[PDB]
Amino acid sequence: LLRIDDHDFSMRPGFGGPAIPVGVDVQVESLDSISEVDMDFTMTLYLRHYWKDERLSFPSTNNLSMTFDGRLVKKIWVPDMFFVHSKRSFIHDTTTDNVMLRVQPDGKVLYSLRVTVTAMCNMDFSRFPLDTQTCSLEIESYAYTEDDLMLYWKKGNDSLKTDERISLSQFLIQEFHTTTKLAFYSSTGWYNRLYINFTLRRHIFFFLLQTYFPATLMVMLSWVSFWIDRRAVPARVPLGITTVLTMSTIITGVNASMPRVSYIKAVDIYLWVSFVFVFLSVLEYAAVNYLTTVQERKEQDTHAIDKYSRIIFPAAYILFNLIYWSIFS
Amino acid sequence: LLRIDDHDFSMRPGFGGPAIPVGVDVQVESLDSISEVDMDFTMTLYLRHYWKDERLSFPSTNNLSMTFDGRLVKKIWVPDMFFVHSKRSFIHDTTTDNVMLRVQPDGKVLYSLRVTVTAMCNMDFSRFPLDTQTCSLEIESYAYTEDDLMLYWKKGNDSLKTDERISLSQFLIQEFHTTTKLAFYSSTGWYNRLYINFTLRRHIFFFLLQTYFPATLMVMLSWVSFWIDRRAVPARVPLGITTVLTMSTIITGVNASMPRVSYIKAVDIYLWVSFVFVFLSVLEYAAVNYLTTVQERKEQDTHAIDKYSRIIFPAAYILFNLIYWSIFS
Amino acid sequence: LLRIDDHDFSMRPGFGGPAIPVGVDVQVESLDSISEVDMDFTMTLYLRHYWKDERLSFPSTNNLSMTFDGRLVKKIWVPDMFFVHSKRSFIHDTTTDNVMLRVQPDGKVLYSLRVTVTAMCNMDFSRFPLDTQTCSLEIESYAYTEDDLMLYWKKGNDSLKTDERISLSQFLIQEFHTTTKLAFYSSTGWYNRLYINFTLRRHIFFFLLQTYFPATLMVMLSWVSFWIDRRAVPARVPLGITTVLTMSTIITGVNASMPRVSYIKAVDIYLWVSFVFVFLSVLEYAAVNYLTTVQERKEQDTHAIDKYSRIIFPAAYILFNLIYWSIFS
Amino acid sequence: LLRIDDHDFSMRPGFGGPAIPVGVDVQVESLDSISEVDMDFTMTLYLRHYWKDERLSFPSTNNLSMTFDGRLVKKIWVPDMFFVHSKRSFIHDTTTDNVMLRVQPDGKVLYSLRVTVTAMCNMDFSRFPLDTQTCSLEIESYAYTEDDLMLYWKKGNDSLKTDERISLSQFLIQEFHTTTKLAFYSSTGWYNRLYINFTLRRHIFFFLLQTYFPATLMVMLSWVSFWIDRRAVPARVPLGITTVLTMSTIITGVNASMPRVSYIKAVDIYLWVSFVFVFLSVLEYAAVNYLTTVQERKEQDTHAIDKYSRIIFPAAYILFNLIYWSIFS
Amino acid sequence: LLRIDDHDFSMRPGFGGPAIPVGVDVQVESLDSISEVDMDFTMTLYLRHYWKDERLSFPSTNNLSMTFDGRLVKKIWVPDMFFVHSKRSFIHDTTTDNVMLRVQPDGKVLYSLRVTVTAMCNMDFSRFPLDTQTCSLEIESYAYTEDDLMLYWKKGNDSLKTDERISLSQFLIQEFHTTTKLAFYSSTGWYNRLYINFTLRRHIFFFLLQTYFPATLMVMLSWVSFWIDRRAVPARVPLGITTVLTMSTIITGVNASMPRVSYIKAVDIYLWVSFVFVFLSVLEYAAVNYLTTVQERKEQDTHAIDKYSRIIFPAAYILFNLIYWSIFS
Numbered sequence A, B, C, D, E: 001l002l003r004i005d006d007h008d009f010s011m012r013p014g015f016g017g018p019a020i021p022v023g024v025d026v027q028v029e030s031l032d033s034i035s036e037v038d039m040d041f042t043m044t045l046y047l048r049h050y051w052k053d054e055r056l057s058f059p060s061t062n063n064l065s066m067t068f069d070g071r072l073v074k075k076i077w078v079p080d081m082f083f084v085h086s087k088r089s090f091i092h093d094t095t096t097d098n099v100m101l102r103v104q105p106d107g108k109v110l111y112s113l114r115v116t117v118t119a120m121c122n123m124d125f126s127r128f129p130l131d132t133q134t135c136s137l138e139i140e141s142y143a144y145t146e147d148d149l150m151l152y153w154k155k156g157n158d159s160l161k162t163d164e165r166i167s168l169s170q171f172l173i174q175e176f177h178t179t180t181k182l183a184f185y186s187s188t189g190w191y192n193r194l195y196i197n198f199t200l201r202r203h204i205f206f207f208l209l210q211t212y213f214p215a216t217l218m219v220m221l222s223w224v225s226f227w228i229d230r231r232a233v234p235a236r237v238p239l240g241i242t243t244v245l246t247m248s249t250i251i252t253g254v255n256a257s258m259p260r261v262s263y264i265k266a267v268d269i270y271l272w273v274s275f276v277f278v279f280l281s282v283l284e285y286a287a288v289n290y291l292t293t294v295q296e297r298k299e300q301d302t303h304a305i306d307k308y309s310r311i312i313f314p315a316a317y318i319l320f321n322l323i324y325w326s327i328f329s
Ligand SMILES: *[C@@H]1O[C@H](CO)[C@@H](O)[C@H](O)[C@H]1NC(C)=O
Pocket: A062, A063, A064
């Protein structure tokens, strides 16, 4: 039916004359995973191409479109799109190649395939875990400049569809939209580039329960010391020390999970402030023991330091929390 | 024998006329693994196709079916099934391609191959580890709409078989059955989709032994304090503190294993209630030490708080357990 | 030399008449690894096939066998064996395909290739780490039933050889032997299946040193308390508590390594019995402190409980060990 | 258009006569990751080749360059570059091979492809984490010596371009430049080799916060003991011991991350000096307890050792820090 | 130029007559990694073959050798070497296949390719970490026996070269040399096998610092107890106990890294002897407390046990160290 043997499909339609227009539309099937340590994300999608080539015309009375096996795709000419700034990708091939080819009697062509992509995404963690991130996937022709191929979204803003099943356990996904821009390479020329854009917002529940609450509880334990008889030395001393040494484990277990960035994150601030609050309660009792011993040496109830600490330490931590959750909301 | 050179197998049987019927049946060989963190499962199966094509007719006197080498599959036309919402898959190929082709003299065809698939499955953990999950595998044609190909289960409900060796160490597997539904894609049309469905139920033994019992034992240790002379300050204080700090390790070691979901799981409730029970026993002894010191200051046996605590703490935990195992059964 | 262009090698020798006999023999090169968590093992082997096809006859005066390049294997007919219940496999291909083809003037054929296989193996851990396991590798034709192909061991029990270098660091390997059985698939028919069988036995040394000895040592530490003056409250109390909290770490570190099976293992029994032995020593001293305080209240040496405990705790643990190593030998 | 059928492209242009000149230029798209444990780095780049072959001449009136499909690359002759001392690499192939071919009417050729490479890099850690490292990527022809192929940078120092998005979370990247050298293989001859060179500098913030500060804080805790009444034996003893045992955990957690090199790193020096400072504070109190007991035995305030230690320990650590940060800056 | 179309390259040179001689030489580019847990090593190398085939003769006046594209390798006959006892391997293929073919007018051939190999190596750890290991890589023809192919080192002992950059962070590499031996397979015959041999020696610095020193320091801490007043019960008891419990962590952290072999390693001996030294110091103080209490009961300074222990424990450990480092040097 199609006269494949008659033509040289090493050359594009319109070769040696004006540029060929190629239109694109897309459906996203899933957003698969995200990594802070690698700074990337993985996506699976259906991708579709539209153009005309009169070398593929055939006669019929119905004027309708026809589907073909799929092994012909390797004989005819086809556009050459690639995913810019991507780490790895593949086309699915069970039970055969997941590819589709449809042709109309006047030579209009529709071409479709299913792919998975892993792509680069630069991330800012200064407000982590209360952060928002924005991401994009980039599409471009490899060999042909804007003088030979013209690339555009087939139906404007209606060219992107999304599966209703798409979900991530840790993020809310929002704000899917598409854009276009021109790109330049010094050695080879000017090219059209298409963009798919989206926004992510992290759920904080896990971190409250797993990090902010146990820090708070250690700080509240350190306050119990102020209500204990100053003469019980081997009770008041280890009560302070053990909370210092627990807080260090909390601080380590958080930071072991994240990339080694050169700046402070919002969670770091809270934990190190909590640490100094606990550390100071140890110096307070050392002072009261020393001054008691000086009183014994002069001579030979509750101390004013204890009396004031019962008031000052809790007020100060409440003030800190009010400020912190006013800044990070 | 088969006249392969005579025909154009880029076109389906019946091309330009009504739809071709294709029937399917399946045997599951193994259910290989499951992941909560990735929310997916892996399956290995045998998959079979049935249709008629008169271009493959041949003469004989016996009217019986004949087997062919397998290299012909790439010359003739074959249906184009794919696994919807799948992450990855392959066809096995040692010592050769695991593929089978059988043909009858009137052109009826049977085609079979062996494959492994990894597929998406959305999971709810609000009742974890006492949870039940349900799963499915989806099958569809890639290129041909219901106007060109008709896809159905070959023998109704008898079209699914399962290997007697199938097992998972952590789940009971039940309720294998099959269904059908129509699907729509905005750019390309309507398609028939087949479903394989099944249910999983988790064994709880591991979690009892590994999580609920040691929490319970920490709570019971904290009660020993109420039976110890109130004057033994450096004994009663670390006895409380060490149980607080152990309970925190238990809570961490559980949640380190699971995905970071935005809601509370049934195991979380038990551990955090156990934590407050242990935390309160520390505040109780602080109260008794303070009131004893006030009595010393006024002046200058067992305390009523100890007397009551010996009764109230164990009753309250028993009431909690009765309610919890009434809710989660 | 071989008349490859004359014949249609899509059809088996004897096509449309009786079954073709194919004989097999094997040499194992290595048993590569084993996993309890995945329940599988990996093996590398040489696999060999024997049959006659008169379409490959050629003339000569010597009556001897001749070797050919290996690229012909893809032109002639070849049997279609596959490994049943396998997870993955491949054929080696550096510096070329590791394949061999030898032919005699009357058309007898010898065919050989090198492969690695990973295969399923169901494991029972009720006696772990003192367990024994048994395993097998299964071989079958994919497309041809016993009416068209007949599959058998070429030399009976002498058909399996094993490399003298084969070893595993954790298991003793024994009892290599071969068997045969018929298999049935509802949709497709009856098939011959060959079996390779073997037995494994675990070395216990590592577990003695790494698990049973340190548990025993914690139990013996808890006994020291009975020899310490009952008035040293802040010594006798933490001596008990710290052994409880160490034993919990031992119990966790063992079970973190194994699959989450729904039944108790032989190592679990020993560790939880050791735990209750340590837990009871804490309740004993609580009793002696309480009764001493009652004596003080009445009034206002070694206690009989201490005196008896020095005898009863060690006897009871020795009785337990005698029973346990009588059961698990 | 191109007369591909006329010629034998198993032979280079100029075969049997002088060497063919081939020019190269490059753009780096990303520097992907780095490993101290494996001593390697990964890079993604665009690579371009320039030469003349009159067998590819064609007629035209415009004198302009033309682009071709990409399937012709496998028919014509092409240069044979490889990455020396590399571990693994690949060429990208979705949605097709990422390859470009452009030809001028006189037979000048431009050829381009996109690749990812992982390459060897020897690292020195004697100053870690305050270290600087230098790296290079090497390019060479596999089959052709300088007598048959001449390889050079196409535009001198202007032949290397870099993407403005390139970044690493842990390193500052600097000093990209290119060089050339001749190489010799004993069995096969002399070859031209091109070099891409660059420098890395590590950010220290993470290590200050994660390692140097908590060590310092343990040392400062050990000093509190000198301010506590010498008669409080069960307070002063565990205060020392617990800091010893914490410092050991710090030392372990650092070195667990790095390769097992045979020499000391700058971080090791700081932690082991901090350890002896803490260890000595335990021997000091043992001395004061012993001498007090001798005074009791003779007989039957603050001790001079305490008085001096309050001065000497902090001065000595401050002197150490001044020297250390003078050496490592 | 080469008459490739004239001949049947499914047959070796000399087919049906005497054996063809094939010579080999090698250059090692890198030794990439080593695993105790898997018992294997990885190597990257250049491998070269030499033979004569008159079917490849061509005319010329210069009598010099000529290089060809590389796509011809798949048309002509080539030898069939494989790596015996190997786990996996591949040939590199960016930017094309890393393969070289050179031919002289009389039909002498040189053939070369670049490969990476992972190979089996049995290891003995009885002296670990002071151990020495020896390794080899094995090379053989797959299909052809010594009656058809003769395989030898091309230049005797001069046939192996090594890159000056080769290094491992944990081992000293020494003693590279080559050997030959004949091998027999029962079903198929006799074959020539070539060997590459080498020796490794481990650096001990890491283990001294990471394992032997901290054990020693725990033992020295336990000795402090002997210098402390026997009446300070709640000081002397936890001082012993905490060192016992630290030593157990040291023992665990070492053995978690290695394979589970059925015999004792040299590091195990040192750590378990150190453990009993620490354990005995706890029983000593229990004895002194008991005998003091008996003296109190009879009645109703430093004890001789303390006096002697100050001398005996350190002498005994010094004697142990002298013996141990005399045995393991
Ligand atoms: C198809 O084209 C024919 C003319 O060739 C026209 O009559 C018919 O309406 C067209 N149908 C559609 C659906 O565009």
